Design a protein around this ligand. Structure first.
Ligand SMILES: CCCCCCCCCCCCCCCCCC(=O)OC[C@H](COP(=O)([O-])OCC(O)COP(=O)([O-])OC[C@@H](COC(=O)CCCCCCCCCCCCCCCCC)OC(=O)CCCCCCCCCCCCCCCCC)OC(=O)CCCCCCCCCCCCCCCCC
Ligand SMILES: CCCCCCCCCCCCCCCCC[C@@H](O)O[C@H](CO[C@H](O)CCCCCCCCCCCCCCC)COP(=O)(O)OCC[N+](C)(C)C
Ligand SMILES: CCCCCCCC/C=C\CCCCCCCC(=O)OC[C@H](COP(=O)(O)OCCN)OC(=O)CCCCCCC/C=C\CCCCCCCC
Lengths: 174, 121, 347, 104, 97, 140, 169, 114
């Protein structure tokens, strides 16, 4: 078909190719933006929409901004673009050839020999009937977190709280 | 892991009611009194580290230590005997469970068997 | 940082490990480590030094990447068996990574390089706690996944931890780095026998913790650090140097002493498995481990390095703030040898 | 030391989240509930070790339930077969305009 | 396993190799780590969407939380190291690898 | 991979010395690449050409050691025609050190390498003869 | 190799009323057609295999057909006056029309004469008699492998105890 | 599809505005005209390090609230669960901790913002 989810996976992976190469944190922040929107799109394709919008909100709408603060604290004059060094750009190309070899393996249509077998063909094939009443599986699925899963709520509450305490006990020391 | 995960039994209880039936260690089991002296010497080092006039001082606390370790040493001995008695039991039950794999081998005598002799030279 | 907060941190570390020791679901284990981390970093940052900061940077950076690989390998396990219960793992490519992640969490070689450094960066309080309490949780999960471990992979790190735990121990002066190589060496002995029989592991664990409690309480008691700094102590409070000697020998596992109990059960267990060669190499190298305990003993109690004059006034002043738990931690870590059989209490 | 205090005290605070079945809100079925149910009913007193022998078949069917691995290798073999016949065969006319829309 | 999963896993492998090739100022590493986090998230969520294993719909978000949480911590340490230098990994006080 | 040692394992006996020697050369090359890998990893060569010089060094050396070891072993097998006793490897073991002795241009290191590499190899053969488990399965 | 019903044997003339029209009157449809219906679903959830209950799955079709045949001869113009009102909304919400339902429900309650169920009524689970056996093992499944013995006696003291190494007792 | 189509038309629209923005005035760029603005007089140096603890000291707190609201989101749907008393405590609980966290910051003087 469109293979649209899969090509999104490809743009995702190159999003990590330009991201995992390390050319000033700001451009890497761009890398996680691209990989971020691609991510939420990909998970949206299975219809877990609420989650894809969590990451598109909580992650990218949160994190990469605070990184857009760290660079204000780090920067250094003349930050490097991807093209600005032989090892960085060499690295980016180094990612591209590999992932392209994977796509060529997709052209081969044979199961992947790397690491462990990748069964091949289109993504749609694994889908099953999504039949349900006037509610998505996800909705009540996460709604369950409160009523039906109090324990996790306890440890997350406690954890985040004392994480705030830790931020205090690091920054105040100075 | 063995023993752990054994059918029946419950996790955190230190000591099964299934024990109890085993005789308790007697009051002056030498292992136990050794727990005594262990506590004793610990009580003594407690003085020596903190200067103190060793031995005569704090004879009080020293008595606390020896009573402490002998006390815990007691129950620890009970669980010891319980555990070993347990593995012995499971072992014998299993040897009845599979008689075939634990053959009652016939015992030929020395007259019956040949064995090579090696002269010392 | 006021004690009321410090204690909440340290208690949430205790909780952050207890949680690993309780929960059966994997996600709560990864939460167990994860909560453990956040609560572990700040306590390294008390007093705060330009040095300590990069110490914590090391520790966090490695623990974070370890936890990452771990969660990845969990997810792969789920992908190929749809489970969350601990139990056996069902895909070797995942299993080896869970072994790796835990291998960082113990600090086993060749992942080990962070541990000698981090220890250098913090005070002996935070140090001791790092070398004992942090060693619980990852072992607490390894005991649960002993059933399916790929023994080859485990024994290789288990040995190499002992060689590296040796050679890197002969070289250093300041004690904290040495304590680091001691622990990094004992973990080789714990994680070695793990595929074969976990109860021996937990035994060895208890002895190790008791031991390093003995040492760090002593170093605290004398506030020694660099070897020379330790050397002066023979004249001021002779007893405690005269006791570091012994606890060191119990590290060395000279046979009357308690520290021999681990090795000598381990050698038993592995020998039932045949595998006769491995314990021989292991036991031979443990000697090499002993030798720098001995040299360190020479700096201290057996021989008197020259005293500095200024020491004399210090003679008038008794040490204070006694640490109650100490004497028992010495004695248990030494005299207990004719109480091996009690190990079966651990079933 | 897998302390299992949650079991001795019966708190169950963790246990619910485990397993494909095990009561889920609005009783929504797992996609592979059945093979899983059979496979677990197979698993009790057998405990862990012998369990990887005797219950293997059940776990296998459960595996294919999870990944649909084999049915995909097959279905792939068919679709790749069809290309060879693409000039030798014209497949099926209805797919294009059959009673499938009348079918409901 | 369908090729898409293989692709995300590979994105993980790159999200690790990038962390470990590890160069210059370390802020890049906190990025690469967060990228790693994101790949694990997505790889989890696709699965929970797959088998309709509904309870586990709660996990990915919870995963996300702590993971984001530690990263949130990480910057703070960087601050301190940035505080005395203007950050670079190239400068480390500690001895013996 | 284990398949490679498995390749070397089917000697058989010592027949066709080349077939064996190629495999030993392969193993020596592998270990050479690993040692070179960590060496580069932990001793930042500075100027990458020097780094490939380094790896060329170690790789070629270990490959050489494996080659000469393999062929001297099999030749001794095909000449003494004993051919199964452990000493049959030991010469090659002793030979191997000399190879290592040549590249290092030192009598000392070559001399020690002769003895210890020899004893190690002898123990290996002895082990194949005796099924020593090195990494025994949990069994217990 | 899997058993399947012939392409024909399944075949039945379809209900072909549109979904909006269907919904407009379904609220009565549950009230009238019923016994075949619940027999059907109870038959389904028993053995899970559809083929087993496919025939009842025919019977329900024809039953519904008879239902609409009863409809068309009587109420229809009021009926069309009703579902036309409803199909106009893409939410299919009942609240938007309602008033026509006065027309329709009255013309039925008189001219064909029987009541509309109240809102709290259809949801409740219904008792249903059935003659066919409940299936032996619906999962088919296999044998349950023999459990390890939970054998026990009583604990005599260890034969010499702590037999490891030199310890005597 | 639907949404991807509107994304494409929007982005292409904007990019079109960019291209008609540059390739149109068709006049003379030159140096010093292109020099960065600095209220007349030339800059004393390119932008460097406007460092402040008072940035992260709060911004991090932002991040740890945003993670919290991420948990608040399930609430509207969770409200319809069959057993609210099991839920309701937690519904309050996190908010308390949210507040609690803030409260802790409120008075350790960690919230100096600015
Ligand atoms: C009142 C206060 C005083 C109470 C103490 C009174 C005397 C108690 C006593 O010592 O004898 C126990 C005594 C009789 O002992 P037993 O059961 O007949 O066995 C003694 C044999 O030696 C058989 O004993 P065993 O079978 O237990 O053998 C000992 C065995 C297992 O037992 C042990 O491990 C203990 C040995 C370790 C050292 C003992 C420390 C000193 C005590 O250990 C070993 O064989 C190997 C030892 C490991 C060596 C490690 C390396 C060393 C270098 O028990 C009593 O009930 C006597 C109490 C009578 C009234 C007391 C009031 C008088 C005032
Ligand atoms: C800040 C400084 C750092 C401090 C860090 C140190 C912390 C030390 C913690 C040591 C852990 C010990 C465990 C004790 C918990 C008590 C709970 C006890 O009742 O557990 C029961 C089991 O009983 C315990 O086994 C009792 C252990 C008692 C400890 C001492 C035993 C004998 C010591 C042997 C060495 C010789 C020294 C003896 C001299 C006195 C139930 O567990 P079970 O469900 O059944 O099986 C669990 C799985 N296992 C076996 C693999 C763990
Ligand atoms: C592979 C792993 C197996 C290990 C193989 C054997 C390991 C045992 C050896 C462990 C310690 C060996 C050396 C450690 C200490 C050391 O190097 O000391 C060298 C030092 C040099 O002086 P410096 O310290 O540099 O400074 C001088 C200032 N005045 O001098 C010494 O102390 C050397 C003498 C002491 C060590 C000698 C030990 C005796 C031989 C060791 C093993 C022999 C095997 C026994 C024979 C029986 C065969 C089964």
């Amino acid at each position: 078909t469109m293979y649209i989810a899969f090509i999104l996976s490809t743009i995702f992976v190159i999003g990590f190719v330009g991201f995992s190469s390390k050319p000033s944190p700001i451009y890497g922040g761009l890398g996680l933006i691209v990989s971020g929107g691609v991510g939420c799109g990909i998970v949206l394709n299975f219809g877990g929409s609420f989650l894809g919008l969590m990451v598109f909100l909580i992650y990218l709408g949160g994190m990469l901004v605070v990184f857009g603060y760290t660079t204000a604290m780090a920067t250094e004059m003349y930050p490097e673009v991807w093209v600005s060094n032989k090892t960085v750009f060499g690295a980016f190309v180094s990612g591209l050839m590999m992932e392209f070899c994977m796509v060529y393996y997709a052209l081969k249509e044979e199961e992947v020999e790397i690491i462990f077998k990748f069964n091949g063909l289109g993504d749609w094939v694994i889908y099953d009937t999504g039949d349900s009443g006037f509610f998505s599986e996800e909705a009540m699925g996460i709604a369950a977190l409160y009523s039906y899963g109090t324990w996790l709520v306890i440890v997350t509450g406690w954890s985040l709280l004392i994480g705030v305490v830790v931020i205090m006990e690091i920054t105040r020391g100075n | 892991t063995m023993m752990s995960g054994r059918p029946g039994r419950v996790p955190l209880q230190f000591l099964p009611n299934e024990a109890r039936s085993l005789p308790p260690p007697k009051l002056t089991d030498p292992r136990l009194v050794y727990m005594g002296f262990l506590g004793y010497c610990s009580g003594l080092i407690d003085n020596a580290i903190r200067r103190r006039p060793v031995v005569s001082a704090g004879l009080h606390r020293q008595l606390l230590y020896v009573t402490s370790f002998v006390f815990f040493g007691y129950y620890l001995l009970k669980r010891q005997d319980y555990m070993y008695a347990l593995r012995d039991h499971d072992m014998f039950a299993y040897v009845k469970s599979h008689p075939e794999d634990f053959p009652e081998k016939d015992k030929k005598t020395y007259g019956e068997i040949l064995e090579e002799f090696h002269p010392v030279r | 940082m006021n004690p009321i907060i410090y204690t909440t941190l340290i208690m949430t570390v205790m909780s952050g490990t207890m949680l690993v020791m309780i929960s059966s679901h994997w996600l709560l284990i990864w939460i167990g480590f994860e909560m453990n981390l956040l609560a572990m970093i700040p306590v390294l940052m008390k007093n705060f030094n330009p040095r300590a900061t990069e110490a914590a940077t090391k520790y966090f950076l490695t623990q974070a990447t370890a936890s990452m690989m771990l969660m990845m390998a969990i997810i792969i396990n789920l992908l190929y068996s749809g489970q969350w219960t601990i139990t056996k793992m069902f895909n070797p490519v995942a299993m080896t990574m869970m072994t790796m992640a835990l291998a960082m969490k113990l600090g086993l070689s060749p992942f080990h390089f962070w541990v000698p450094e981090v220890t250098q960066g913090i005070s002996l309080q935070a140090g001791l706690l790092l070398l004992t309490w942090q060693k619980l949780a990852p072992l607490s999960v390894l005991c649960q996944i002993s059933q399916s471990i790929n023994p080859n992979l485990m024994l290789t790190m288990a040995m190499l931890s002992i060689l590296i735990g040796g050679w890197g121990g002969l070289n250093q002066t300041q004690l904290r780095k040495i304590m680091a190589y001691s622990s990094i060496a004992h973990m080789g002995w714990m994680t070695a026998v793990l595929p074969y029989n976990t109860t021996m592991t937990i035994l060895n664990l208890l002895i190790y913790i008791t031991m390093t409690l003995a040492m760090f309480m002593l170093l605290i008691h004398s506030s020694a650090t660099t070897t020379l700094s330790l050397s002066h102590t023979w004249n001021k409070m002779p007893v405690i140097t005269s006791l570091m000697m012994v606890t060191l020998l119990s590290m060395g596992g000279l046979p009357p002493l308690s520290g021999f109990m681990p090795k000598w059960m381990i050698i038993q267990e592995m020998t039932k498995n045949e595998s006769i060669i491995m314990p021989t190499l292991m036991a031979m190298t443990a000697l090499l481990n002993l030798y720098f305990y001995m040299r360190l003993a020479y700096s201290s109690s057996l021989t008197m390095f020259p005293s500095t004059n200024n020491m004399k006034m210090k003679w008038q002043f008794e040490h204070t703030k006694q640490m109650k738990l100490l004497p028992t931690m010495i004695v248990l870590s030494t005299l207990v040898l004719p109480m091996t059989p009690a190990l079966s209490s651990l079933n | 030391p897998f302390f299992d205090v949650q079991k001795r005290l019966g708190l169950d605070l963790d246990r619910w989240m485990t397993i494909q079945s095990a009561e889920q809100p609005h009783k929504i079925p797992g996609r592979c509930h059945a093979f899983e149910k059979e496979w677990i009913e197979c698993a009790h007193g057998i405990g862990g070790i012998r369990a990887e022998k005797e219950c293997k078949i059940e776990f296998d069917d459960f595996v294919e339930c999870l990944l649909r691995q084999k049915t995909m290798k097959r279905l792939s073999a068919i679709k790749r077969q069809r290309d060879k016949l693409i000039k030798e065969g014209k497949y099926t006319p209805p797919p294009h305009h059959l009673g499938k829309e009348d079918p409901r | 396993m369908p090729l898409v999963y293989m692709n995300i896993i590979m994105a993980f492998a790159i999200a690790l190799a990038g962390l470990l090739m590890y160069r210059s100022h370390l802020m890049s590493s906190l990025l690469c780590l967060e990228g790693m986090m994101l790949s694990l998230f997505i790889m989890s969520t696709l699965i929970i969407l797959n088998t309709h294993f509904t309870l586990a719909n709660m996990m990915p978000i919870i995963l996300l939380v702590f993971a984001a949480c530690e990263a949130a911590l990480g910057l703070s340490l960087l601050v301190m190291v940035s505080n005395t230098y203007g950050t670079d990994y190239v400068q480390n006080l500690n001895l013996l690898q | 991979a284990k398949t490679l040692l498995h390749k070397y394992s089917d000697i058989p006996e010592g027949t066709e010395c080349h077939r064996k020697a190629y495999a030993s050369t392969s193993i020596g090359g592998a270990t050479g690449l690993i040692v070179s890998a960590y060496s580069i990893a932990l001793k930042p060569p500075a100027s990458f050409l020097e780094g490939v010089a380094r790896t060329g060094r170690y790789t070629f050396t270990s490959a050489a050691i494996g080659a000469i070891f393999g062929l001297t072993s099999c030749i001794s097998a095909q000449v003494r025609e004993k051919p199964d006793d452990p000493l049959n490897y030991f010469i090659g073991g002793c030979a191997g050190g000399l190879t290592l002795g040549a590249r290092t241009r030192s009598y000392g290191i070559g001399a020690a390498a002769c003895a210890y590499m020899g004893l190690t190899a002898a123990l290996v053969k002895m082990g194949q003869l005796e099924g020593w488990q090195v990494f025994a399965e949990p069994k217990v | 190799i899997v058993e399947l019903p012939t392409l024909e044997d399944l075949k039945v003339q379809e209900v072909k009323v549109s979904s909006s029209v269907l919904k407009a009157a379904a609220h009565h449809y549950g009230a009238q057609c019923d016994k075949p219906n619940k027999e059907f679903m109870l038959c389904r959830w028993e053995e899970k295999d559809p083929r087993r209950c496919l025939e009842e799955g025919k019977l329900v079709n024809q039953c519904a057909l008879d239902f609409f045949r009863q409809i068309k001869r009587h109420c229809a113009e009021p009926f069309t006056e009703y579902w036309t009102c409803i199909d106009y909304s893409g939410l299919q919400l009942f609240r938007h029309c309602r008033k026509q339902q006065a027309k329709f429900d009255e013309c039925v309650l008189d001219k064909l004469g029987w009541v509309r169920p109240d809102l709290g009524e259809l949801s409740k689970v219904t008792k249903v008699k059935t003659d066919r056996p409940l299936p032996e093992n619906p999962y088919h499944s296999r044998a349950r492998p023999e459990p390890n013995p939970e054998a026990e006696g009583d604990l005599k003291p260890a034969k010499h105890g702590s037999r490891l190494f030199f310890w005597t007792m | 599809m639907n949404i991807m189509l509107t994304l494409l038309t929007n982005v292409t629209l904007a990019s079109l505005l960019v291209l008609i923005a540059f390739w149109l005035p068709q006049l003379n760029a030159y140096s010093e005209k292109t020099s960065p603005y600095e209220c007349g007089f030339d800059p004393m140096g390119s932008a460097r390090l406007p460092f402040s603890m008072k940035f992260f000291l709060v911004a991090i707190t932002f991040l740890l609230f945003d993670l919290e609201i991420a948990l608040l989101l399930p609430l509207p749907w969770a409200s319809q669960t069959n057993n609210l008393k099991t839920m309701l405590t937690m519904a309050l609980f996190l908010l308390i901790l949210l507040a609690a966290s803030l409260a802790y910051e409120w008075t350790q003087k960690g919230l100096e913002w600015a």
